Coordinates of C-alpha atoms (C1' of nucleotides) and ligand atoms in Angstrom, one line a residue:
Chain A
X411 CA -18.5 42.5 -52.1
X412 CA -17.9 39.6 -50.6
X413 CA -18.4 35.7 -51.9
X414 CA -21.9 35.2 -50.6
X415 CA -22.1 38.0 -52.4
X416 CA -21.9 37.5 -55.6
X417 CA -19.7 34.0 -55.3
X418 CA -21.0 31.4 -56.9
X419 CA -21.1 33.9 -60.5
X420 CA -17.8 34.4 -60.1
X421 CA -16.1 31.2 -59.7
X422 CA -18.0 29.4 -63.0
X423 CA -16.7 32.7 -64.9
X424 CA -13.3 32.2 -63.9
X425 CA -13.5 28.5 -64.4
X426 CA -15.0 29.5 -67.3
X427 CA -12.0 31.7 -68.7
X428 CA -9.4 29.1 -67.3
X429 CA -10.6 26.8 -70.4
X430 CA -10.7 29.4 -72.9
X431 CA -7.0 30.2 -71.8
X432 CA -5.9 26.7 -71.6
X433 CA -8.1 24.4 -73.6
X434 CA -9.1 26.4 -75.7
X435 CA -6.6 29.0 -76.9
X436 CA -8.5 31.2 -77.1
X437 CA -7.3 34.2 -75.0
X438 CA -9.2 37.3 -75.3
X439 CA -13.0 34.6 -74.7
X440 CA -10.4 34.3 -71.2
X441 CA -9.9 38.0 -70.9
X442 CA -13.5 38.9 -71.7
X443 CA -15.1 36.4 -69.1
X444 CA -12.7 37.3 -66.7
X445 CA -13.6 40.6 -67.2
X446 CA -17.2 40.4 -66.6
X447 CA -15.7 38.8 -63.5
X448 CA -15.1 41.2 -62.1
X449 CA -17.5 43.9 -62.8
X450 CA -19.6 41.7 -61.6
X451 CA -17.2 40.9 -57.7
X452 CA -17.6 45.0 -57.9
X453 CA -22.0 45.2 -58.0
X454 CA -22.8 45.3 -54.6
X455 CA -25.6 43.5 -54.9
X456 CA -26.7 39.3 -55.1
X457 CA -27.7 39.3 -58.7
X458 CA -31.2 38.0 -59.3
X459 CA -31.5 37.9 -62.8
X460 CA -28.8 37.4 -66.6
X461 CA -31.2 41.0 -67.5
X462 CA -29.5 42.6 -64.4
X463 CA -26.5 41.4 -64.9
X464 CA -26.8 42.7 -68.3
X465 CA -26.3 46.3 -67.0
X466 CA -23.1 45.3 -67.0
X467 CA -20.0 46.3 -69.0
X468 CA -18.8 43.4 -70.2
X469 CA -21.7 41.2 -69.0
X470 CA -23.2 40.2 -72.6
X471 CA -26.1 38.4 -73.7
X472 CA -24.4 34.9 -73.6
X473 CA -23.1 35.9 -70.4
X474 CA -26.9 36.4 -69.2
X475 CA -27.4 32.4 -69.9
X476 CA -24.6 31.2 -67.5
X477 CA -26.0 32.8 -65.3
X478 CA -29.6 32.8 -65.8
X479 CA -28.6 29.4 -66.1
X480 CA -26.8 29.1 -62.7
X481 CA -29.6 30.7 -60.7
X482 CA -32.3 29.0 -61.4
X483 CA -30.6 25.2 -61.4
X484 CA -27.5 25.4 -59.2
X485 CA -24.5 25.1 -61.8
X486 CA -23.9 25.3 -65.6
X487 CA -24.3 21.9 -67.7
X488 CA -21.4 23.2 -69.7
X489 CA -18.9 23.3 -67.2
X490 CA -19.8 20.3 -65.8
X491 CA -19.3 17.8 -69.0
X492 CA -16.0 20.3 -68.8
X493 CA -15.1 19.7 -65.5
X494 CA -15.0 16.0 -65.7
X495 CA -13.5 15.6 -68.8
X496 CA -10.0 13.9 -69.0
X497 CA -8.1 15.7 -71.4
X498 CA -9.8 18.7 -70.3
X499 CA -8.8 18.2 -66.9
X500 CA -5.6 16.7 -67.4
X501 CA -4.4 19.7 -69.4
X502 CA -6.2 22.9 -67.4
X503 CA -4.1 21.0 -64.6
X504 CA -1.3 20.9 -66.6
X505 CA -0.8 24.7 -67.2
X506 CA -0.4 25.0 -63.4
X507 CA 3.3 24.4 -63.2
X508 CA 4.9 27.8 -64.6
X509 CA 6.3 26.7 -68.3
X510 CA 3.7 24.6 -69.2
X511 CA 1.6 27.2 -71.1
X512 CA -1.6 25.8 -73.4
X513 CA 0.3 24.3 -75.7
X514 CA 2.5 22.3 -74.2
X515 CA -0.4 20.9 -71.9
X516 CA -1.6 20.1 -75.2
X517 CA 1.4 18.3 -75.6
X518 CA 2.0 16.9 -73.0
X519 CA -1.6 14.8 -72.8
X520 CA -1.9 14.2 -76.5
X521 CA 1.6 11.6 -75.2
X522 CA 0.0 10.4 -72.4
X523 CA 1.3 12.6 -69.2
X524 CA -1.3 14.2 -67.1
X525 CA -0.4 14.4 -64.3
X526 CA 2.2 15.8 -62.0
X527 CA 3.5 11.6 -61.3
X528 CA 3.9 11.8 -64.9
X529 CA 6.0 14.7 -65.5
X530 CA 8.4 13.9 -62.4
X531 CA 8.5 10.1 -64.7
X532 CA 9.2 12.4 -68.2
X533 CA 12.7 15.6 -66.5
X534 CA 13.1 14.5 -69.9
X535 CA 11.0 16.3 -72.1
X536 CA 10.7 19.0 -69.6
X537 CA 12.4 22.1 -70.8
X538 CA 14.3 23.8 -68.3
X539 CA 12.1 26.4 -66.8
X540 CA 9.9 23.9 -67.0
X541 CA 11.2 21.1 -64.3
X542 CA 11.3 24.7 -62.0
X543 CA 7.8 24.6 -62.0
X544 CA 7.6 21.5 -61.5
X545 CA 9.8 21.2 -58.7
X546 CA 8.0 24.2 -57.0
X547 CA 4.7 23.8 -57.8
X548 CA 3.1 23.6 -54.2
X549 CA 5.4 26.4 -53.6
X550 CA 4.4 28.4 -56.2
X551 CA 0.9 28.6 -56.1
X552 CA 1.4 30.0 -52.4
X553 CA 1.2 33.8 -50.5
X554 CA 3.7 35.5 -50.0
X555 CA 2.6 37.8 -46.6
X556 CA 3.6 41.5 -46.3
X557 CA 6.0 40.4 -43.5
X558 CA 7.6 37.6 -45.4
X559 CA 7.4 40.5 -48.7
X560 CA 8.8 42.7 -46.5
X561 CA 11.5 40.4 -45.0
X562 CA 12.3 39.3 -48.3
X563 CA 12.8 43.4 -49.7
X564 CA 15.0 44.2 -46.6
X565 CA 17.9 41.5 -48.3
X566 CA 17.1 43.3 -51.5
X567 CA 17.5 46.3 -51.1
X568 CA 20.7 45.6 -48.6
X569 CA 22.7 43.6 -51.2
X570 CA 21.1 45.8 -54.2
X571 CA 23.7 49.1 -52.2
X572 CA 26.3 46.0 -50.8
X573 CA 27.0 45.7 -55.1
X574 CA 27.1 49.5 -55.2
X575 CA 25.6 52.5 -53.7
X576 CA 24.6 54.5 -57.2
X577 CA 21.5 51.7 -57.7
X578 CA 18.0 52.1 -57.3
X579 CA 15.7 50.1 -56.3
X580 CA 11.9 49.6 -55.6
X581 CA 9.9 46.7 -54.7
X582 CA 6.8 47.5 -56.8
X583 CA 3.1 45.4 -57.5
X584 CA 0.5 45.2 -55.0
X585 CA 2.2 45.4 -52.0
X586 CA 4.2 49.0 -52.4
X587 CA -0.1 49.8 -52.4
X588 CA 0.1 48.2 -48.9
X589 CA -0.9 45.0 -49.7
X590 CA -0.6 42.5 -47.3
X591 CA -0.1 39.6 -49.4
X592 CA 1.1 39.0 -52.4
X593 CA 2.1 36.1 -55.0
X594 CA 5.8 37.1 -56.3
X595 CA 8.2 40.1 -56.2
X596 CA 8.9 42.9 -58.5
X597 CA 11.9 44.6 -58.1
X598 CA 12.9 47.2 -60.7
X599 CA 16.0 47.7 -61.1
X600 CA 18.0 50.9 -61.6
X601 CA 21.4 53.0 -62.0
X602 CA 22.7 56.3 -62.8
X603 CA 25.6 54.2 -65.8
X604 CA 22.2 53.4 -67.3
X605 CA 19.7 55.7 -69.9
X606 CA 18.2 55.0 -73.1
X607 CA 20.8 57.0 -74.8
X608 CA 23.9 54.1 -73.2
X609 CA 26.1 48.9 -69.3
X610 CA 25.3 45.5 -69.5
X611 CA 26.4 43.8 -66.7
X612 CA 24.5 45.7 -64.5
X613 CA 21.5 43.6 -64.3
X614 CA 24.2 40.0 -62.9
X615 CA 25.8 41.8 -60.3
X616 CA 23.1 42.0 -58.8
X617 CA 22.1 38.6 -59.5
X618 CA 24.6 37.5 -58.9
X619 CA 25.5 39.3 -54.8
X620 CA 21.6 37.2 -54.4
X621 CA 23.1 33.7 -55.4
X622 CA 25.5 34.7 -53.2
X623 CA 24.0 34.8 -50.0
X624 CA 21.5 32.2 -51.1
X625 CA 18.4 34.7 -51.5
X626 CA 17.8 33.6 -55.5
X627 CA 17.8 29.6 -55.2
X628 CA 16.9 29.7 -58.8
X629 CA 16.7 30.7 -62.5
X630 CA 14.5 31.2 -64.9
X631 CA 15.7 33.5 -66.9
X632 CA 18.6 36.5 -67.4
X633 CA 18.5 39.0 -69.7
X634 CA 20.4 42.2 -70.3
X635 CA 17.3 43.6 -68.4
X636 CA 14.4 41.0 -67.0
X637 CA 15.7 38.6 -64.9
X638 CA 13.0 35.9 -63.6
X639 CA 13.7 33.8 -61.1
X640 CA 13.7 32.1 -57.5
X641 CA 14.2 32.9 -54.2
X642 CA 13.1 32.1 -50.1
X643 CA 14.2 33.5 -47.1
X644 CA 16.3 31.4 -44.1
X645 CA 15.1 29.3 -41.9
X646 CA 15.6 29.5 -38.1
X647 CA 18.1 25.8 -38.4
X648 CA 15.0 25.0 -36.9
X649 CA 11.6 26.7 -37.6
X650 CA 10.5 25.2 -41.0
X651 CA 12.1 26.3 -44.1
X652 CA 9.2 29.0 -46.0
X653 CA 8.3 28.2 -49.1
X654 CA 10.1 29.5 -52.5
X655 CA 8.7 32.3 -54.1
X656 CA 8.5 34.3 -57.6
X657 CA 11.1 36.8 -57.6
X658 CA 11.2 39.6 -60.8
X659 CA 14.5 41.9 -61.4
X660 CA 13.6 44.3 -64.0
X661 CA 16.5 47.2 -65.1
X662 CA 16.0 50.1 -66.8
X663 CA 17.0 52.7 -67.5
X664 CA 17.0 55.8 -65.2
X665 CA 15.3 58.6 -67.5
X666 CA 12.3 55.7 -67.7
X667 CA 12.5 54.2 -63.9
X668 CA 9.6 56.1 -62.5
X669 CA 7.6 56.3 -65.5
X670 CA 8.0 51.7 -64.9
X671 CA 8.2 52.7 -60.9
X672 CA 4.3 54.1 -61.5
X673 CA 2.8 51.4 -63.9
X674 CA 5.0 48.6 -62.5
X675 CA 3.4 49.6 -58.8
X676 CA -1.2 52.0 -60.0
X677 CA -3.5 49.3 -60.0
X678 CA -5.3 48.1 -63.4
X679 CA -7.6 50.3 -62.8
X680 CA -5.7 53.4 -62.0
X681 CA -3.6 52.8 -64.3
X682 CA -6.8 53.3 -67.1
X683 CA -7.9 55.8 -65.3
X684 CA -4.5 58.1 -65.9
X685 CA -4.2 57.3 -69.1
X686 CA -7.4 57.8 -70.1
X687 CA -6.8 61.0 -68.4
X688 CA -3.0 62.0 -69.8
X689 CA -4.7 62.0 -73.2
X690 CA -7.8 64.6 -72.5
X691 CA -5.2 66.7 -71.1
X692 CA -2.7 66.4 -74.2
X693 CA -0.9 63.9 -73.3
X694 CA 0.1 59.9 -73.5
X695 CA 1.3 57.8 -71.4
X696 CA 3.2 54.6 -71.7
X697 CA 5.5 52.3 -69.5
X698 CA 8.5 53.7 -70.9
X699 CA 8.1 58.0 -71.2
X700 CA 5.4 60.8 -70.8
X701 CA 5.7 62.2 -74.2
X702 CA 3.3 65.3 -75.4
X703 CA 0.4 65.1 -78.2
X704 CA 0.6 67.5 -80.9
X705 CA -2.8 69.2 -82.1
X706 CA -2.7 67.1 -85.2
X707 CA -2.8 63.8 -82.9
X708 CA 1.1 63.7 -82.8
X709 CA 3.2 63.5 -80.2
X710 CA 6.6 64.6 -79.3
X711 CA 9.6 64.4 -77.2
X712 CA 10.2 62.5 -73.6
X713 CA 9.9 64.3 -71.6
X714 CA 12.1 64.8 -68.4
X715 CA 10.7 62.3 -65.2
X716 CA 12.0 62.1 -62.1
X717 CA 9.8 61.7 -59.6
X718 CA 6.4 59.7 -60.0
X719 CA 5.2 63.2 -58.7
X720 CA 6.2 64.4 -62.2
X721 CA 3.6 62.8 -63.7
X722 CA 0.9 63.5 -62.5
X723 CA 2.3 67.4 -62.7
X724 CA 2.4 67.1 -66.6
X725 CA -1.5 65.8 -66.4
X726 CA -3.2 67.8 -64.2
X727 CA -3.4 66.2 -61.2
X728 CA -2.9 65.9 -57.4
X729 CA 0.2 63.4 -56.4
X730 CA -1.3 59.9 -55.1
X731 CA 0.2 58.1 -52.6
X732 CA 0.6 54.5 -53.9
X733 CA -2.0 53.1 -51.5
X734 CA -5.1 55.4 -52.0
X735 CA -3.8 53.8 -56.1
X736 CA -6.2 51.6 -56.2
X737 CA -8.0 53.1 -58.6
Chain B
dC30 C1' -20.3 43.0 -89.8
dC31 C1' -16.4 43.0 -88.9
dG32 C1' -11.5 44.0 -86.1
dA33 C1' -9.9 45.3 -81.6
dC34 C1' -9.5 42.8 -77.3
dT35 C1' 2.9 44.7 -74.3
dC36 C1' 7.2 42.7 -74.7
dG37 C1' 12.0 40.7 -72.3
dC38 C1' 13.3 36.2 -72.6
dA39 C1' 14.5 31.3 -74.5
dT40 C1' 13.1 27.9 -77.8
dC41 C1' 12.3 26.0 -81.9
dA42 C1' 10.9 26.1 -87.4
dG43 C1' 13.5 27.4 -91.0
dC44 C1' 17.6 28.9 -93.8
Chain C
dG1380 C1' 25.3 28.5 -88.1
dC1381 C1' 22.0 32.9 -87.7
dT1382 C1' 16.9 35.3 -88.4
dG1383 C1' 12.5 35.0 -86.7
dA1384 C1' 8.3 33.0 -85.0
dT1385 C1' 5.6 31.1 -81.3
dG1386 C1' 5.1 30.0 -76.9
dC1387 C1' 5.7 31.5 -71.9
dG1388 C1' 5.0 34.5 -67.9
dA1389 C1' 3.4 39.2 -66.7
Chain D
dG1282 C1' -17.4 36.9 -75.6
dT1283 C1' -18.1 42.0 -75.3
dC1284 C1' -18.0 46.1 -77.1
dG1285 C1' -17.7 49.6 -81.0
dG1286 C1' -16.4 52.0 -85.9
Ligands
LIG1527 NA1 -0.1 28.6 -64.9
LIG1528 NA1 2.0 28.2 -66.8
LIG1529 NA1 0.0 28.6 -68.0

DNA sequence: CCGACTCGCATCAGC
DNA sequence: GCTGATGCGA
DNA sequence: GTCGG
């Protein structure tokens, strides 16, 4: 459903969602507007009235009205007022820097810090994460074309294997489902030396390696199971430098790896469909395990999982390739 | 009418 | 010092 | 803001 179809309504709503998250700090209002704006992007019909829209799941009365004012006039008075509000402007913008959330942004704008220049004038009051968000502001808002991701995947599989032949790594996310474009790289790692009933240097030895070969240029966080940081593909000595990109590497107990792979892969709507369908078939699925729901509602022990396919067998579902996992 | 709408890591509040 | 809260991102 | 117990 193209941008000309019902794009104007959707940008409105998303603009409204941003301000609820960034200025009002009303995360559920943020997720509301988003939810409305998303189902609206599904509807294959240039919407003609708020009434029409209200028939959808997630469009309530108040949004129906906003669409009504949008449709009649071309704009929403609330947005325009918000659009040219100084503090709201600067607050909403500053959150675009990774590491600055609405609380930090609101604090910066309190003491006059409103623009990247202001941030740059004040490395002092920026934690480590925020400086990397500043540093890579432009690079981080860029998407990653699939061939770059495919290239990045080469480096990650090669060096991980080179650290140990026992590691298992899967780039998940949209990419794994076939998407011609991604916004970050989501690596799921595991070893046979790591069960849920069990070493605390398994992730550091892969992180280190990828810094030795100068793939990982920066670090936002690293612990015993999650690394978040920056990487960038090597340039041609003549051809321009690639933009730095965000990467996440996550260590998972091998007895839960294929559970996490499915979850960190499958689309949102797919994942609900399956945890909708798993319950009616008597099992419960979270990111970690699959447990059988006993008669009176009580979940039992987690059952073996050793493939993605396995989990479909438990719930009586044909395995679906990640490419066909849109919903 | 009224509550619902996950978690590992950095960092701060408080002891 | 250490525990727990809160922010952030995802 | 929206849904629903
Ligand atoms: Na952001
Ligand atoms: Na941010
Ligand atoms: Na933010």
